[PDB]
């Protein structure tokens, strides 16, 4: 493949999100600030910041249809941002009623409701009441046991894949009346009342991420044991047809994105993304998209010479510092789509603790 480094953030970024037109993107940093960036010719430049929160901002997600930004942070509060006609953005607090720090947020594919993961044993799902202009949260506390580490919606807009930190993968129905209509019968189930245990699957570690297939009839989750498991549901209260597990020889995976109806791209502490080709019969690692082991008479400038003396003085080597082969320098955060019709993705972006926002061109 081929990758282009979009920007070099000065600080680690655990999340990013692009607008529908892919014109400007929002990203988080280490502190309570949330950063905005816009294109400057061939590069990107700073746009504005948000200091509404008080503690470390955890996750940020952009709604492409309505062009809205939500932000859930460690301060147990959620802010929803909508741009004003003049150009500025209007903040709006959402009362999550949580007891611990939020961890992960996602917009529904219809963007009517958004679910919030949390370490307070619960998950908060919020919608908008036009009659009161209010956001109200509902707690999902029946089967949950540990911290929420990831979220994943379903194309039916009702099922919600929750990646818990109790070595068990969770799927729940987030259907709510007055917002969503009745959903069609699904392989996951048909009778879907609010807060019902759709499915439960085990793992060999904390479920860092979960993901439904583009067809919507599967789940893929990765534990902390560097193993990605692809689930194929059969019927309600019926064991899945096949639980394919692929075990790797690298660092544990972090986030999972579905390249197409039969391909999964996932990246973690290995500083690189991977690809999975297969079907119901099985799966296997296909290729290392990060070039693998690439290992990538003249005057000396004043800055270089000063650097050489500083390294010599503070050090005993005065040699090149890292020269790390992989494009990223630290653990990767997440993978999100960039362009293409559903089930047809060729470009997807990624962010990491090094601050690099590296687009990946399949």
């Amino acid at each position: 493949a081929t990758s282009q480094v979009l920007h070099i953030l000065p600080k680690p970024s655990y999340e990013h999100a692009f607008n529908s037109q892919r014109t400007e993107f929002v990203t988080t940093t280490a502190t309570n600030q949330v950063e905005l960036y816009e294109q400057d010719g061939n590069g990107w430049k700073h746009a504005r910041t948000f200091s509404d929160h008080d503690k470390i901002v955890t996750c940020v997600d952009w709604a492409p249809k309505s062009n809205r930004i939500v932000t859930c942070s460690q301060d147990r509060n959620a802010y929803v941002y909508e741009k004003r006609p003049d150009g500025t953005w209007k903040q709006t607090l959402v009362l999550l009623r949580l007891n611990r720090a939020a961890t992960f947020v996602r917009w529904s594919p219809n963007e009517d409701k958004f679910a919030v993961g949390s370490g307070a044993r619960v998950i908060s799902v919020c919608y908008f009441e036009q009659e009161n202009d209010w956001w109200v949260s509902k707690h999902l506390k029946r089967p949950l046991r540990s911290t929420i580490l990831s979220l994943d919606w379903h194309p039916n807009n009702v099922l919600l894949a929750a990646g818990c930190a109790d070595r068990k993968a969770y799927v729940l129905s987030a259907y709510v009346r007055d917002v969503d209509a009745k959903p069609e019968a699904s392989v996951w189930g048909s009778r879907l009342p609010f807060n019902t245990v759709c499915a439960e699957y085990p793992s060999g570690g904390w479920v860092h991420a979960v993901g439904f297939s583009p067809s919507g009839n599967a789940l893929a989750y990765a534990g902390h044991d560097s193993s990605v498991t692809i689930a194929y549901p059969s019927a309600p209260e019926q064991p899945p047809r096949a639980l394919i597990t692929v075990k790797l020889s690298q660092l544990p995976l972090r986030s999972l994105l579905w390249a197409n109806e039969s391909a999964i791209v996932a990246a973690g502490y290995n500083y690189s993304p991977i690809l999975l080709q297969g079907n119901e019969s099985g799966w296997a690692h296909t290729r290392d998209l990060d070039a693998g082991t690439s290992k990538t008479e003249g005057p000396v400038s004043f800055t270089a010479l000063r650097s050489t003396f500083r390294n010599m003085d503070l050090k005993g080597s005065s040699q090149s510092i890292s020269s790390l082969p992989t494009v990223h320098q630290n653990m990767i955060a997440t993978l999100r789509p960039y362009a293409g019709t559903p089930g047809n993705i060729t470009a997807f972006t990624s962010s990491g603790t090094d601050g690099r926002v590296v687009l990946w061109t399949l």
């Binding site: 650097s307 503070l314 050090k315 005993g316 510092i321």
Partner: protein
């Protein structure tokens, strides 16, 4: 400092100040020294009269050894009856000191050097006995071994000045051998003293310093002549360093220096063990600094703007 001083510095400075002064002042200070010896200075009777007292646990043994006469012919008519709680006392009045400055300085030095002056009585006695046996053996060479043995038996002298220390000295027709019953408590002290004593033995061996008195050290066993001597445990934890002083080592021009040196030996060893501890401290920190240098990798280059001095950039641009 490498060599420990041979007298009490406080007494020397105090005596010099009070002799050179014009208006004396009443003083009452008790001062301790090495090895448990304690000095007391007071002016009870007259502001111009100063009394100095000596405290030592082993002093009665010194009296048995004949130290009163040595003190008498050392300190002249200055001798005064001892005070309560002390062994030897001296009373000095500033109205009778010699006018010449050098006499005053030497008197102050002599008074400040009272420790070895009272402790050197066994050494002087051993030297006199050595001279006697030397002339007697020079009278007839064939009469040496039996008088040597009888001197090793009868003239075998000993003293306990610390409860883990002992000096055993005895003369001969040509030499005055001395045995030190060294032992260190405070475990780490003994730990470093093992290395110190081992290196101290080797020293003499080196041809570089053969002129020094012969050293003999062997722990867990005492020499032949002092196993029967009371007070010498059967090698519980005590070392035994033995110095053999030949005729050349106490020539009439070098007796006092040798006496003071052989007396201060153990205190020098202790102080230098402490100095070695300090040497470790400084070296150890000095190159854990090098370890910090090694660590200072893994820090990406960053820029601080001004941080000028004792402040914060002192400017807005």
């Amino acid at each position: 400092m490498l060599s420990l001083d041979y007298n009490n510095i406080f007494i020397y400075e105090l005596l010099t100040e009070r002799f050179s002064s014009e208006n004396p002042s009443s003083i009452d200070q008790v001062v301790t020294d090495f090895d448990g010896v304690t000095f007391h200075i007071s002016t009870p009777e007259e502001k111009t009269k100063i009394l100095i007292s000596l405290s030592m646990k082993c002093y009665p043994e010194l009296v048995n050894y004949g130290t009163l006469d040595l003190l008498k012919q050392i300190y002249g008519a200055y001798v005064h009856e001892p005070e309560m709680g002390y062994n030897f006392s001296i009373l000095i009045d500033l109205q009778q000191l010699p006018a010449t400055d050098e006499e005053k300085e030497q008197l102050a030095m002599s008074i400040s050097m009272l420790k070895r002056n009272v402790l050197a009585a066994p050494f002087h006695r051993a030297f006199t006995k050595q001279a006697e046996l030397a002339d007697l053996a020079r009278k007839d060479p064939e009469n040496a071994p039996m008088l040597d043995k009888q001197a090793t038996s009868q003239e075998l002298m000993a003293i306990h000045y610390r409860d883990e220390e002992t000096i055993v000295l005895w003369p001969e027709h040509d030499r005055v051998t001395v045995v030190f019953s060294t032992k260190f408590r405070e475990e780490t002290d003994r730990i470093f003293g093992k290395v110190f004593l081992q290196e101290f033995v080797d020293a003499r061996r080196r041809p570089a310093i053969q002129t020094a008195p012969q050293v003999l050290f062997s722990y867990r066993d005492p020499p032949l002549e002092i196993r029967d001597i009371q007070g010498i445990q059967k090698g519980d934890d005590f070392g035994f360093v033995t110095f053999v002083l030949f005729e050349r080592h106490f020539t009439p021009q070098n007796r006092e220096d040798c006496i003071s040196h052989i007396q201060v030996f153990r205190n020098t060893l202790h102080f230098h063990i402490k100095a070695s501890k300090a040497y470790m401290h400084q070296r150890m920190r000095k190159r854990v600094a090098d370890f910090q240098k090694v660590l200072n990798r893994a820090k990406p280059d960053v820029e601080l703007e001004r941080k000028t001095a004792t402040g914060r950039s002192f400017v807005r641009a």
